[PDB]
């Protein structure tokens, strides 16, 4: 209940590296905090709140410090685990004074990490106060709020409606080039040897954040100060790596890559789809859109891809618990197809209101097995057909850790195959 | 809780366009706020509350501003997300002072948008206060209240009884002629080029409101002020259209039209049914009444129409998730027919009230499938027979976006098909 | 909470018309409020409360005003939607002062409409206070209370025990002769033309109250004052009739009449039963007693009558959703017969009380279908046998809208058919 | 919250008539209130509370007035619908002052009718106070409490434990000789004609109390004062009888008698039983006792009696809804026999814990039908065998309305049949 800062940061876009795509979506806020009078006189409207969700230590705080730093504007930073009811509470009266001090020091930026504890009675009185405080203040104030979290699924859905945090940005765990740039950000301060290679350190860290990697480069100098050395060598670097041993094994990495390449392939091959994106080893579909039967079969096909890719590559005994949600998602889509949208000829256009006769349930299930197995046999076949260019995609994927959409189809072009422009 | 405005509006029936049918039902309120002493001395009774429900940004606020504006009467406005309990509360004492200030500034109009948050037990004590405040004041006060919402299904049913909001008006998302008139309202202020066409902008905006369309015409001048131009050209207009890409694709528009024309045809053809209304692409069936077996089959037939129209036009692989509620509604009607109203010869006049033997459940289901498939085969056949007049409807429907029942019937007349006078007035 | 009247009414039995049977049961209260000293010195006991339940606007308030008016005694009136808890409450202390002011102005009458909102724990504290306030005061006080409602099913069952409202009177929606007499009460004040006929207005209003009818005759003079006429003609009368369009269609009226005639026939024909009452087109089983198997079959037979009458008259496609409760009630009686009272030879004298094997459930259901279909085939056969005198009843019933049991019997006697003496007295 | 009396009654055992068996169980209280010093010096212990339960108007108040009247001791009478919470409440402080005033006016009697409303939170604070107030006071105080009710099933079970109302007495609706004596109690005050017969009035009143019969003899004099007569004749007596038209029809009376004679016969005939009592037309079995298989079959047999008697006398179409509880009770006993006590050879000594396989449920049910039908066929047969003496018992039963145990077996003796001394 006492953590918020008000500093003019020294940490800009130089201290942050690896999340270049995330950097391109925060530049419109940088141009806004620099000159809000340029945004006010024109007639535009900025986001009243920008969300920074992801795994613990992905660089949530550092991104918020870079936006205020690059724009030469103040930075405020408090925690959400601070506001806890201890003798009823004045949790709501707090929020009222945040925007009042922001208008006194306008333009400026505000930040609140782990706001999922206060925002999950008295708890809703403080939560609803923050909602009104966002809808009240306008563009003329020249201030913006950023609220981070460790879990996005446990925050209140009302803290996501327009005017009450409408922009959503995801900060992912760093890849090979993502970690190599992090290992160059912290290395500017510390003294490193001539025999040290940052590329092997970046390669041998799957399932490790930018913050958990900072713990490794700080303990390497700590072990160099304990032993007695003026240069951080490979011996103390590899020692801190054993403190960590969680992490993705190289065998698992292969399984993940093949699974991920399955989905990707499936989409870049089916009749008509809804955009293929970046393929990375670093770990519902109905919306307000209207779909036909052909569309949903392909939705199921993609969902089944990775498992089929696993089955094709490692065999029946090789399939993993990775396809857990994909299997579920696919089946559920298939039950909605049969029992809800009447897309089963055997079951007819009847719609089961989810007292249903056992025979009808049988018919529904039997048809859902028919759809799933049918599409699964179809996915397996496509992987079987494109095994060799996939093998290659997977090698590229294991080294880079993340491959965008383009190059995959180009790797397929190398194997004389034309897919479809679905990036 | 603390938003309330009492302005003499400058925005009248000139600033609102596209909802001409909605405009005809609010003119009796315009003649009432102008001279209430004419309505008092005669002996008539006005609505104590008029509902303005629809999608977010359909022009709920602007319609309420036009009624007060055209009648030259004040306009009060506040939000329903304001009155939230913060240490028990004094939310009821508020409502008491609304009608008191209204009688001091009589005649005048009152408006409250998103009243679904306050009206969804402290919450019920503020809710019940508003109910009494409506039944208390009479015609002599010369004041009316209008309460808007983003969802009509989440408001309290007591806020719909006579004397406590008895009038219901729906504001729909604008069509082609509805958006073209909206594209002429916000263009009076801004400077437009000679090469710009508002008809193509209106045609390329399916699933877009009047408020989401002003966001497009305001960003087009913003992009013209950023680049450096004195005239808003087609280049910056089409650019703001890419910022939007929750819209209906042209292929989807066809699917929607065929589905919607299915329902209409079904209804306009059914032996006996009751009323067919405006057909449009822009996206419990009993009442008190008494229906016979023949009636309910036709009710199911209509419900199945659109899907059958989809199946006939696009094929088995072409049927969409659009028929979701129709399919459900139809099945439920068929179960009520079998298990509740004893309209199944095989099942008899027995009536199931949920301990029911597995065999009987089987029999019930098997008959429900028999009725649904039977009627569905019937709908498909009706569509098949009138494919050509239906394609002609679909054509009109895609261009105008909304057609009337009379317009539908006229197209059929042209093909030499006389349909039942099931048209609403 | 704050409505309470105490006027000496001008409205007597002259202003109330159509409910003549309801008027005969309120005359003992008229003779009581006129001279209570005649009722006290003799030794008799009057009802401490008389219930006035029915549809909204059946003439609940007007009946209570006629009893006080005819007896030349004061009339107190208040609403039940007034007493709502707002900061805990002092709702019980109110009821205490009602009977105290009644003893000061003795003899007098008290009335409370919509008492179903206050009487549906603070809510129970005010409710229980009213219960004690009834048991406390006696015949010597010379006062009587009348509490009306819009729904009888939502009031507390304790407000129906002896000493706490023991008398129950139902005010029904007016019929043809009922509405014609209503049309003559509200016409004494207004000026009517020579070409106007009140009999056609009385005939073309099915499913319309005495109050919803007053809305029609008041708007007819309103349209005559708007247009500019000194006499209310047929043109403005028929115009106000289009403002109304949840009425009963003439086709529906026939279906209702036939259904209603089925139930009556079934009754007046069955071996032995428990009386047949007024048959009317104007739109939870048994007591302790002790019944035999033969009686319950006949109870089911009557329940099935109307549906059988529908099937016989309109055919299989013609059966309506009207038989919904009958069908249910009949089936439930049949399950109680089989699974509870061991009246099924196939199932034996075992008594199921819900872990029952699937086979036994099957046996139970199969027997219930056997009973229902058996009795239904029996009802259909009776309606078929008596289709002719029944068509006659239906005819009388459509014109009069309501016929007595005796009127039915009579119609049958004409076709030389003796029925059982099962009419109520 | 203001109803209790403190009178020296004038109404004794002369004003009460028909409930002579109930009169014999209240005489030990009469000898106690007369001289409690005789009961205290000897060493005996009287009941701290005596229950008076039955139908509304059976003569609950009048019995309590007769005990205080015959013993020449005061009588206190309040209602249980008086103590209702209106602004929290001082319901408990009341009970404390009842026994204090009782010790000041010792010896005396206390009475509370409809105590089921106060005794069904704050409600339990007043209820528990009455419990302690009973256990506290002893024999030396020379006072006794009597609490009546309209329903015995809705009062608290704690108001039935020893020291807290241990004595239970049932006051039944009057019979023919029961009503004839009531019609002679109220007739002492009023003037009756020479052509009037009280025996026909007593015969034509089935399902009518002593209080509901007082309403008839008071309205007969009211109709005699309205018309203008000095003597209450048969014309005004029969008129008040039409105000009543609830009542048992003569056809129903026959059905009831036959049913009741069924049970009676069954018990007076089966292998070994647990006492047959008075047979009257006026409308679980496991306890802390151990039963064998033979015993429970006979328990079921009796339970099925009346229905079998109905079936034998009126036929299959003639069976009534009267056997409702008997049928249920019998079946439940049969399920406990099969599924709980393992008394079914087909089902074995397994005990179903009331996830039970459908087949086993079938087996259980099939055996319960086997027991019920078997015993039912047995009951029907016994009625069939003793139809003629039963016919007679039923005639005797219709005229007297209540026949004790003895005479039934004597009526059977008249038809040369010997039953067993089970009275
Ligand atoms: N992507 C990154 N690039 C550079 N440094 C990083 C990155 N992510 C984390 N760090 C460093 O890790 C440390 C702690 O991480 P932090 O930003 O607080 O993580 P989070 O806010 O997600 O919990 C900081 O010193 C920060 O510089
Ligand atoms: N049966 C009737 N006969 C005559 N007038 C009637 C009748 N029923 C209703 N009205 C008239 O309708 C008006 C309002 O009806 P009201 O008595 O208040 O209905 P309710 O009390 O059932 O809600 C009154 O002016 C009353 O005279
Ligand atoms: N068994 C009876 N014998 C004589 N009089 C009776 C009998 N039962 C009731 N009464 C009379 O009926 C009247 C009211 O009955 P009451 O004793 O108050 O019934 P309860 O207490 O069961 O409600 C009294 O005047 C009483 O004398
Ligand atoms: Zn996957
Ligand atoms: Zn549809
Ligand atoms: Zn019916
Ligand atoms: Zn019995």
UniProtKB/Swiss-Prot annotation, chains A, D:
Keywords: ATP-binding, Cell inner membrane, Cell membrane, Hydrolase, Membrane, Metal-binding, Metalloprotease, Nucleotide-binding, Protease, Transmembrane, Transmembrane helix, Zinc. One of its GO terms (cellular component) is plasma membrane. The active site is at 260. It is found in: Cell inner membrane. Its main location: membrane. Coiled coil: none annotated. GO terms for biological process: protein catabolic process; proteolysis. Its EC number is 3.4.24.-. Acts as a processive, ATP-dependent zinc metallopeptidase for both cytoplasmic and membrane proteins. Plays a role in the quality control of integral membrane proteins. In the central section; belongs to the AAA ATPase family. In the C-terminal section; belongs to the peptidase M41 family. This is ATP-dependent zinc metalloprotease FtsH. It comes from Aquifex aeolicus (strain VF5). The gene is ftsH. The chain holds residues 142 to 606 of 634 of the full protein.
UniProtKB/Swiss-Prot annotation, chains B, C:
Residues 1-425 are cytoplasmic. ATP binds at residues 54-61. Its EC number is 3.4.24.-. Its cofactor is Zn(2+). Zn(2+) binds at residues 259, 263, 326. GO terms for cellular component: plasma membrane. The keyword Cell inner membrane applies. GO terms for molecular function: ATP binding; ATP hydrolysis activity; ATP-dependent peptidase activity; metalloendopeptidase activity; zinc ion binding. It is an enzyme of class 3 (hydrolase). It is found in: Cell inner membrane. GO terms for biological process: protein catabolic process; proteolysis. Acts as a processive, ATP-dependent zinc metallopeptidase for both cytoplasmic and membrane proteins. Plays a role in the quality control of integral membrane proteins. The isolated protease domain (residues 405-634) forms a stable hexamer. This is ATP-dependent zinc metalloprotease FtsH. It comes from Aquifex aeolicus (strain VF5). The gene is ftsH.
């Amino acid at each position: 209940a006492k953590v918020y800062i008000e500093e003019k940061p020294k940490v800009t876009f130089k201290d942050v590296a690896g999340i270049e795509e995330v950097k391109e979506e925060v530049k419109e806020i940088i141009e806004y905090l620099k000159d809000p009078v340029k945004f006010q006189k024109l007639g535009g409207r900025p986001p009243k709140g920008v969300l920074l969700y992801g795994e613990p230590g992905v660089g949530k705080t550092l991104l918020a410090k870079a936006i205020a730093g690059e724009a030469h504007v103040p930075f405020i930073s408090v925690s959400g685990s601070d506001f806890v009811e201890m003798f009823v509470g004045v949790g709501a009266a707090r929020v009222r004074d945040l925007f009042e001090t922001a208008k006194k020091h306008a333009p400026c930026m505000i930040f609140i990490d782990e706001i999922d504890a206060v925002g999950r009675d008295e708890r809703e009185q403080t939560l609803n106060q923050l909602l009104v405080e966002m809808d009240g203040f306008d563009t003329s104030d020249g201030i913006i709020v950023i609220a981070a979290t460790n879990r996005p699924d446990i925050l209140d859905p009302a803290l996501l409606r327009p005017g009450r945090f409408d922009r959503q940005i995801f900060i992912p765990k760093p890849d090979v080039r993502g970690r190599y740039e992090i290992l160059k950000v912290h290395a500017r301060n510390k003294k490193l040897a001539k025999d040290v290679d940052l590329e092997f350190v970046a390669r041998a860290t799957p399932g490790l954040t930018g913050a958990d990697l900072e713990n490794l480069l700080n303990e390497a100098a700590l072990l160099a100060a304990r032993k007695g050395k003026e240069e951080i060598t490979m011996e103390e670097i590899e020692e801190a790596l054993d403190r960590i041993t969680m992490t993705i094994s190289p065998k698992e990495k292969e399984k993940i890559a093949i699974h991920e390449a399955g989905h990707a392939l499936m989409g870049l091959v089916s009749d008509d789809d809804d955009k293929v994106h970046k393929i990375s080893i670093i770990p519902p579909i109905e919306d307000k859109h209207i779909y036909d039967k052909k569309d949903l079969y392909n939705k199921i096909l993609v969902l089944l891809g990775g498992r089929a890719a696993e089955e094709v590559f490692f065999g029946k005994d090789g399939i993993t618990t990775g396809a857990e949600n994909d299997l579920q998602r696919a089946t559920d889509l298939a039950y909605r197809m049969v029992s809800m949208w009447g897309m089963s000829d055997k079951v007819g256009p009847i719609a089961i209101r989810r007292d249903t006769s056992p025979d009808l349930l049988r018919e529904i299930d039997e048809e859902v097995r028919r759809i799933i197995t049918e599409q699964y046999e179809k996915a397996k076949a496509i992987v079987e057909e494109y095994k060799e260019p996939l093998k290659a995609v997977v090698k590229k994927l294991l080294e880079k850790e993340t491959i965008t959409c383009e190059e995959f189809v180009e790797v397929f072009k190398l194997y004389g195959i034309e897919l479809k422009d679905k990036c």
